[PDB]
Paper text:
Pregnancy-Associated Plasma Protein A isoforms, [name]-A and [name], are metalloproteases that cleave insulin-like growth factor binding proteins (IGFBPs) to modulate insulin-like growth factor signaling. [name] shares 46% sequence conservation with [name]-A (with mature numbering for both proteins used in the text). Both [name] and [name]-A contain an N-terminal Laminin-G (LG) domain and a catalytic metalloprotease (MP) domain that itself contains two Lin12-Notch repeats (LNR1 and LNR2). [name]-A specifically cleaves IGFBP2, IGFBP4, and IGFBP-5, and its cleavage of IGFBP2 and IGFBP4 is IGF-dependent, while [name] cleaves IGFBP3 and IGFBP5 in an IGF independent manner.
Here, we present the single-particle cryo-EM structure of the monomeric, N-terminal LG, MP, and the M1 domains (with the exception of LNR1/2) of human [name] to 3.13 Å resolution. However, no IGFBP5 density was observed in the structure, suggesting substrate dissociation during the preparation process, and thus we treated the structure as apo [name]. The structure was reconstructed to 3.13 Å resolution, which allowed us to build a model corresponding to residues 25-926, except for residues 373 – 420 in the LNR1 and LNR2 regions that featured ambiguous map density. No density was present for the M2 domain, CCP1-5 domains, or the LNR3 domain, suggesting that these regions are flexible. [name] is glycosylated and we observed clear density corresponding to stabilized glycans bound to residues N328 and N445 that we modeled as N-acetylglucosamine (yellow sticks). [name] is a monomer by cryo-EM reconstruction. The active sites of [name]-A and [name] overlay with an RMSD of 0.35 Å. [name] features a characteristic metzincin HEXXHXXGXXH motif21 where zinc is coordinated by H499, H503, and H509, and the catalytic E500 (mutated to Q in our structure) is 3.2 Å away from the histidine cluster (with map density shown in Supplementary Fig. 2h). Interestingly, we observed the catalytic water that is coordinated by zinc and hydrogen bonds to Y575. The observed [name] domains align with the N-terminal domains of one monomer of the [name]-ABP5 structure with a root mean squared deviation (RMSD) score of 2.0 Å. The A799V point mutation occurs in a region of the M1 domain that is over 26 Å away from the catalytic zinc as revealed by our cryo-EM structure.
Residue numbers in the entry: 25 to 301, 307 to 372, 421 to 555, 562 to 926
Write the structure that this text describes.
Amino acid sequence: GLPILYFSGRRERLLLRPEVLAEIPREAFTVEAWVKPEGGQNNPAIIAGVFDNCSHTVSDKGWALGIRSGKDKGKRDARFFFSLCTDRVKKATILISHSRYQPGTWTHVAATYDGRHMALYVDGTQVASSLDQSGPLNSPFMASCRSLLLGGDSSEDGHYFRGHLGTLVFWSTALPQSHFQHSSQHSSGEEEATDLVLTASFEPVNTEWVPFRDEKYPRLEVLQGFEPEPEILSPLQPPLCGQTVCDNVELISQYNGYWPLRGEKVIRYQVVNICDDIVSEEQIRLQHEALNEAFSRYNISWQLSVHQVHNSTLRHRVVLVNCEPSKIGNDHCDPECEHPLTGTCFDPDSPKRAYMSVKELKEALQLNSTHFLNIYFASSVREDLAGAATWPWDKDAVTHLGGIVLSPAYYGMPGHTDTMIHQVGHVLGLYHVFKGVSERESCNDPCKETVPSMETGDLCADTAPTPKSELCREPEPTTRFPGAPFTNYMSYTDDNCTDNFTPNQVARMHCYLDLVYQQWTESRKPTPIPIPPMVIGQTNKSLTIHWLPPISGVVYDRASGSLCGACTEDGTFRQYVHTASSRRVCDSSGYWTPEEAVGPPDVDQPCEPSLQAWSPEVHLYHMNMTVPCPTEGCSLELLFQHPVQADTLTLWVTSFFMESSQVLFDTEILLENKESVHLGPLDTFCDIPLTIKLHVDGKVSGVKVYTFDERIEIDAALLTSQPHSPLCSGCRPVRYQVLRDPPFASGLPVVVTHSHRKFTDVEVTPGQMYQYQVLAEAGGELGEASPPLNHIHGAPYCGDGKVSERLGEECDDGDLVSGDGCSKVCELEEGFNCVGEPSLCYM
Ligand SMILES: *[C@@H]1O[C@H](CO)[C@@H](O[C@@H]2O[C@H](CO)[C@@H](O)[C@H](O)[C@H]2NC(C)=O)[C@H](O)[C@H]1NC(C)=O
Ligand SMILES: *[C@@H]1O[C@H](CO)[C@@H](O)[C@H](O)[C@H]1NC(C)=O
Ligand SMILES: [Ca+2]
Ligand SMILES: [Ca+2]
Ligand SMILES: [Zn+2]
């Protein structure tokens, strides 16, 4: 086990005992540490640093390694930093990393300084270097006035570090860059024995370290067994204009190319019958036939399920889309509520009112939205607003609040069956063909579709850019629009000529059916592995192939009604907020309601004002009455459905205005059948999710965030349970099956039952071609095969430590992790200059 020092920001500052170390390096040094930071640390947080001891005033002299945030930004863009200030140069010189740190990821942060060349490395890649400082750090005469601290700063401001510190190593000379990539391989070399000044152990803390100024000892943790190696493949983050992993160019291309990834899917959709004991049976039958005819050519058929609601109470009320009962009486003209019945019982607070909102109908019905696509019938006042649909990337895609709302008069009637097809396409992740030219904000909008592209507009190349036009002809020049797709189902053109979905849109329809709506289909086969396996290691006798998990992300045998969907491969249990509340006046307008802090995060642009996050202060129609937070502070009580021994808690605070560090005045973790534990004020960044490791002796069932800030916005919150939580005890992990171009021994696929997604093959002969395919089988129902990895044994490949101009590689850093100087496609990034066969990128 590796001892670890967790600093919680709760007054834990260590100091080096004088007896342990004879003298701190003065001329040259090399400080390296495995630091696992957590979201929302102090602005100039220090993980370690040598500071003046004799001087009692502010002591920026010496050096400090940690995390710093840009002054011009302050609230966001926090990057690893290393600030050194010798007695010669008046101003401290700060090396700042190139990327904002990743909380929860073990990062090997190192920094060397020998004479003048001071360099800062992250995970072995030199992310900064400078020569501003020169000469020895300080005169030896006052060398006794320099002392080393961990997770703190000498100043009284208390620059506390929040996160884990695994190991700390201190040399007296700047080690070569190649050491850091091979820090675990340079195991106490004989030649550098005299240079190894310090090697912190941390198992006994009292033996080597003493708390600074009565502050408590930082918590001591021990790793039970060897931890999994750091992930070698970076996640497929969505593009700038995308919103999901199915908007990525690589996965989209794989779905367009590999036709098994567009197989026969049979969706299930539910229809809430609306007819006197409005929507008759003929409407349902005709609409179902039209839907099947318009969607079966794309290997998507639909099964009809009609849910008859014999509640006359809901039968009589007019259901209005987006017209909440509380909107009436706001001194403004609301287009959604210009109904005769909204201005015989028009009182919103009456149990027998004749008008209702579709949200209320959804909440009252609470239909099974986990296995069905529910269709609702709300009569919208607007004649042009036929209906609405829920995005896959919205928090309510599969919950009872999701589905399609369609006007009864436009459902199943001849000449109007294509509106439901449009809305269903909206459900399955399809934007409007006029996205980027009609639905564009400004001329600088990246999503603007000037040329057929997979990253702008509706994220489809086949769909040419066209303005929103009702004519079934190429629009007039407003930029020209040749070959406008007025025949596409996702255009505002009438039924008579919108007929087809382009292959790109069909690939999208299938990608989002596998990703989010897997449960809707009747297939028990787990979703398909999105990207083909890639080779991460090769020898003269063995080949190692790594593969991503199923696109849906479910790594367990998904049984209907079970919790296996949210269980990680090691038994962890991740769950978002299930309920919310606020002791401030619960605004009835429906905006910034506690339900906005429920489910997965929704804020598209973090750290800017948004309508998808809870917020106390924001009142639209009361400008003079700027209600401030009470003395007790505005509170948000997020309740999680299932109590579990919490491992971690994450708050998505995506906005705030108070420049003080006390935006979160307190964070009271609520246990079950026990008292609540207060965690005191915590710092947070608007762009990063604040993270807290829960050291609590009980089952956490909620969190009560107290805030003195009026404009703070909590977009969502997540609770991660202890590994091997019981909630997933009955769940069965998903195994994997691998097939090769030649049949394996006996010809059967190899069964990889592990959870780190790696397979080693020893039956490979040099010079032969092999085709690797992977299935994530579960429960005996074998899934779909992955796209084929074609590799000739011995051939060069990315992430093999050898640059090859033959294959177009530039920086083959030896790993498939992007951002570490070179991309996973073995391509030089901006500002990086990777040199040497084991490429060592640098700014
Ligand atoms: C729809 O699914 C069918 C399978 O039922 C796919 O069919 C194959 O099509 C490819 C070309 O795309 C051919 O090379 C194969 O020989 C076909 N096989 C069979 C069994 O038909 C079809 O490609 C899919 N198309 C879409 C748009 O989803
Ligand atoms: C959704 O329908 C399936 C199919 O029978 C059922 O097993 C499941 O329990 C339903 N959802 C809920 C939340 O009950
Ligand atoms: Ca939200
Ligand atoms: Ca290579
Ligand atoms: Zn639309």
